[PDB]
């Protein structure tokens, strides 16, 4: 009778879509049991620590209120007898990650097609920061394509809620952390905000338009300029001293001047200086008119 109840019985397993803390496969839905029912996308918990479980419940709180074109659709949840283990159920969106997506079709996706991508995803961010969220790993694994046409930001994970009277939230104690698309400050001190995601967008441009080519991803290029021969927490410490020398990531080849403009600008070591999106939605949106 509530069709965001999903009682998991009736969950048939498809295949498996990716791991990350979490699992997401693809399910039908299906409890005629005649395989006609609907194929959603299934998130779950690897390891459902009382700890984990928390914080998963708060990631399905944070789904649950964003309603927005460029974000996944929650549909609903699946909760176990006793232990109350939890799945979260989201809408399916069959071209997979814009990463494999990119990845696989390359330069025959071309700049027109890009900057539509980059449209969406400004838009979606600019909606999740009126809610006062900072989504912490914004990278072109987390976005999804549901058709040529149209991605959404995709996993919240990582994502967390401002405090009320403070414009970022400080991770005490952090797991794992994609280094390479963090901002400086996120680096030194583990303070996140609207400013550091902006940071993170600008990575993201960079994904787009390097095609994701693996030479040239962020992990290899800041290795590379700071040494391969580095390792462990060694790496953070030398990539704090890069960025505050400005060391970045190069233009991509091929990358269109005012596309390489909004990067650079993204990864300002000022925060305050570093562009909104309200704004970066409406020069993307310029810069596709003008193409
Ligand atoms: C984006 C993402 C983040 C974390 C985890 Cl655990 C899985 C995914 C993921 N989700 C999907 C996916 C694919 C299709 N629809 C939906 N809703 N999700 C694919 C992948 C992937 N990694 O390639």
Known sequence: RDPTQFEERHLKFL?????????????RYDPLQDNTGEVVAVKKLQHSTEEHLRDFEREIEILKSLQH???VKYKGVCYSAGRRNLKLIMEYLPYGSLRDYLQKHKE??????LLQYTSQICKGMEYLGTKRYIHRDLA????????????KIGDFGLTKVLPQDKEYYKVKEPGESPIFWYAPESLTESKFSVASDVWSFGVVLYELFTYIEKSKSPPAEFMRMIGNDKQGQMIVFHLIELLKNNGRLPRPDGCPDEIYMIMTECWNNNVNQRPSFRDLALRVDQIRDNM
């Open 15 to 27: 295949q498996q879509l990716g791991k990350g803390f979490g699992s997401v496969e693809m399910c």
């Open 69 to 71: 074109d460029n974000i």
């Open 108 to 113: 025959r996706i071309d700049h027109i097609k």
């Open 140 to 151: 072109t694994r987390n976005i999804l394509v549901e058709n040529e046409n149209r991605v």
